Symmetry: D2
Subunit: 293 residues, 4 copies
């Protein structure tokens, strides 16, 4: 199985993509053993990016690696078609889309047609980005089989039965969980890996959990998994999407600028309280020689 | 109380706003007694529009009437600020925003900061577009009072206790329901009216429900409200946002072009089937002398 | 429309029904203008009562008034049948049942069969007690219509559209809201009334709300509804079912003994906080002459 | 890890417990390798049983084995205390309780008091029966930690994150999933096993999934788990709690009488259609030599 990072989008002081900080982060993730980078996912603030900015994000990461899944979805199908077609000039792993978000009560036929449309124009394998809470709808194992053209799925959901169903119904599909808390479990149970937000700031931990589970050292894998869970919990205090920036700086030692409002940067006091929650975890990982310092 | 139309945005065959069809529709609505038009709401596929298209919508509608509430929200705050400031040259009723959508688990503090930021730059009264199922958030009467700067709210929710609460905690606030099925109830109970998707295609009906209810002819208002409910239920068979275009052409006699995929147009068969589902209702409305024929 | 009290069950110190206190309470409610009494509802802890206790509740209240709807439902259909048959000797308004509670994902067919069974043996009109949050399933207007034998429904739900749908699909049915917050609204919108837990402790207020709305004094009705809402909200702080006992004592001046654990009575600190939250309301109500003192 | 059967309660034609059929079923489960029997759980229709009947169940099963967890909860705390006390004379594994069901919005304080009360009188280890969907509330790992007297938990939820949290926060706690679809995954990821309804009718299957996963044959475990899933799915078509009876007779060759209405028995045709759905699976299980012909 794999750890895939849905990579953060660093914004500059004036709210543009900081390509340079993005490249440094990308380099470090690849050097630290991350398998592939998921660009314009939730953790990257995909829905806050224009189609031009979703391209810019791809271009900057592509400077670093070919190991990219390029998320292209949104509520203008022509823009998503255009991004899909432009990816032909990039030797990447695949493209991806979440389901059309915001609008409730969208018919199954229209959902199926949105994805089939993108499969039809895609120059690369297509991955389903399933995120029921964010998008308002679910594209389950059965709908995924009906759509019929997904090479894999990231299933961001707290229901591993639902994730396992993709495998049951689509035996050849790559099936990833979107949770950081299920890295040990996913590797122990025959799934293909995790697209894990927390691998942005603790790629060493996510990779090591996976490796331990693979080696069948489940009690050691769980012990580390449970530590990782505490950082995830700390990150949710002030809002994970903002907190991920602060944590990457804290644990990896380079700056990733700002998120894009209304995903507001943490303030100094929030940043200080968040660091207070994870410093003893940082010491312990250093003690364990998982983190270098 | 008032009926306010969240007016449909007509698109051409190549996915641009059809300004001329928009004007004809806007003009018909006002002539049939609609109080104000809500521009770039859900019904207008606002989340599917770029900032530039949201402004283009305002301009076209403004040629017809200044009775406009102009929706500006999105996930890039700078763009929404820009729209708010640009509205200064338009003599309109107000601007509006829904909450930042898609991202789950946004802190109250961040949500409050988003709206207060738009209040601080707004040259017009600000309306809260509350839509918990679509955006994943609720900005309830307590949070609206915190924010402190709303002249009004559109509460798109079926729970009228929730909508009444805006009035109870904010006695000076204008309080609208976003439901078509609550027009009779809202008028009878002392609220300010409805921002009703169905008023795009049966504005005569929504205005008459309101009028009957004001006259305390509650049973007559409900009979009409109940017929209107059946049209709303029909519209949901193939997807209401797509169906709204077909129902407008059918009942009002002009077309509104195409929706924007992934809000896909009904096909000829679906259109035939929807028309069959509402034909008998049209006959009833004609016998009630609400519609001509 | 009517105000119906789902009457509290007072329990003695040895966890038996305090029949003498129940009778005093029932007599007060009727004297203060309550139309009918709903026995063994949620508010009376019906699900905590054995079939013998449900019958004991009926006999005590029946010593005071025949204006009773007698709730009989539970997870042993033989017992519910026996209670339904036993009620033949009581000259009352109706019997009632909630849907079989606890078990998830019961088939529509089984739910319909349970209700039709009660209808076949019932010597009185049968009322649907609809409470989806509590029972884990909904018996909506369409399922009610398919069941075909309900004289009325109490709809305890936060969705008045759902409640109105009973009237729309079943025009000869009595349709009540289970909410105290909707007395003004239900009266103005053509519904038949409210089975209002808060009428146990402020029967004066619920009746005056309904009277004001009937007189089309909507603003005054809402002003009083909104004060009543504040008392409902305070009752919920420590748990409404327990707080209903304290509030009855506070506003009506007699006590109702203890609830039945695990519906635990409020402790001293909880009572003090609760009273601080309502005493300024209790003064406004005496000033308005709704309460004596 | 272990498989624990939440054992079915067989009822006679006139709705009493069929003690002799219960004993036959218990003995078979134990002989086929089931580790313990969870008596009066959901699958046994525990909420449908009077305290007396819950005691009859224990005494019947106890004649076969002492490997019993005895579920004693309900909405009359005096009865649950009495049951807990009466278990002193049975040399069993533990007693258990689900949270007080039906009543929504019970304060955490009251929930904690209910379980602490049962712990204080219990002469055996206490197990938490967590089932948020059925009871309307969640007693999560944090609340279980607060209560602080549970020996184990059955987490009937689909979210394995939530289940893993009991072990993360309560290291010495025995932690089981209430899901049949998670047998392979629970065994692989270091949890304690599964309280699996479907082990009533296919104990051979559930014990074999576990064993294969224990031997790290995850591929083979999943294949068999996926077959089992298809039986679980079939049982849900006409209602699992009724269907479990039919499936036990079909797979094990002896009958368990009737369920208790409103958990109605399947009819002859529903039974034929259900058997049609699982015939093909029974065939596979025979080829695989998991079942005898
Ligand atoms: Na009640």
């Amino acid at each position: 199985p794999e750890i895939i990072t849905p990579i953060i989008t660093p914004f500059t002081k004036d709210n543009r993509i900081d390509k340079e900080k993005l490249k440094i982060h990308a380099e470090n993730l690849i050097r630290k053993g991350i398998d592939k980078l998921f660009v314009n996912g939730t953790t990257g603030l995909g829905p806050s990016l224009s189609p031009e900015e979703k391209l810019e994000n791809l271009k900057a990461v592509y400077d670093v690696t070919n190991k990219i899944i390029f998320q292209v979805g949104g509520l203008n199908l022509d823009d998503a078609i255009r991004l899909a077609k432009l990816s032909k000039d990039f030797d990447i792993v695949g493209i991806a889309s979440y389901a059309p978000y915001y609008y409730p009560r969208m018919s199954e036929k229209h959902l199926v047609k949105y994805f089939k449309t993108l499969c039809e124009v895609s120059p690369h394998p297509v991955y389903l980005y399933n995120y029921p809470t964010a998008t308002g709808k679910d594209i389950d194992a059965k709908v995924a089989k009906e759509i019929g053209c997904f090479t894999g799925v990231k299933d961001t959901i707290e229901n591993i039965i639902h994730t396992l169903d993709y495998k049951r119904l689509n035996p050849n599909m790559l099936v990833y969980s979107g949770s950081d808390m299920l890295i040990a479990t996913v590797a122990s149970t025959g799934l293909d890996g995790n697209v894990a937000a927390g691998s942005n700031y603790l790629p060493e931990v996510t990779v090591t959990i996976k490796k331990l589970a693979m080696e069948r050292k489940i009690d050691e894998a769980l012990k580390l998994q449970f530590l990782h869970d505490e950082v995830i919990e700390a990150s949710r205090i002030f809002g994970s999407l903002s907190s991920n920036y602060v944590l990457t700086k804290y644990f990896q030692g380079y700056d990733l600028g700002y998120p894009r409002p209304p995903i507001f940067p943490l303030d100094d006091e929030e940043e200080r309280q968040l660091i207070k929650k994870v410093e003893g975890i940082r010491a312990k990982l250093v003690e364990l020689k998982i983190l270098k310092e």
